[PDB]
């Protein structure tokens, strides 16, 4: 994932 704590992934 590009990051954490976001619903996109």
């Amino acid at each position, epitope marked *: 994932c*590009p990051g954490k704590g976001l619903p996109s992934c």
Partner: antibody
Amino acid sequence: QVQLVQSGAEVKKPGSSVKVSCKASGYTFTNYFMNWVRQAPGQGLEWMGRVDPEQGRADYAEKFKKRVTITADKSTSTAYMELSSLRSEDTAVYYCARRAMDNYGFAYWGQGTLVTVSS
Amino acid sequence: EIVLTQSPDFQSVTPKEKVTITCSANSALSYMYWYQQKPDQSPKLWVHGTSNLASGVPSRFSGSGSGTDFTLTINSLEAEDAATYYCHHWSNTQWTFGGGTKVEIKR
């Protein structure tokens, strides 16, 4: 206010290793990845790696997997990046960066830490 | 291995003119990001999601792109707009940056 304060500049001889710190404040440390980026003077940006400070899991770029170790200490909300087997081409400014509140782009950056590698 | 090539490396623009910065890829990719960096400073997030301006970015900046080609456009250039602009993309499981396009004022 989200704040990323890094360690000071450093002079290094070839073959040595440099460890750079990044103190985080203004946000819950473990909820966000801490990315590390570097930029040689006048050259482009290079993503080095990142560490999730909740579990300590890290992801590195293929170029930097061999020599870069990125860690995080939750107690002091400080992140670290260590680069080994230094060479003159490793002379660069090293940033720690965090994503924006509502998207994945890097919105928050540290002041930058200059590491000069030379004899 | 997803390589982002930015053209041109250098560009001089008269104020009030239009400038387009291209960030081309090898594969079709999505969700491009852009940054503005000025000398002796860290980059500032400028565009995210390939078309959404970051907070505080004036509307004369326009992000766009599809498939392999992505563009950042300044429609009425201003003195403050001079900077090096970078593109940024995530291909599993790493980030990668563009070379950078330096924009300077023409007088």
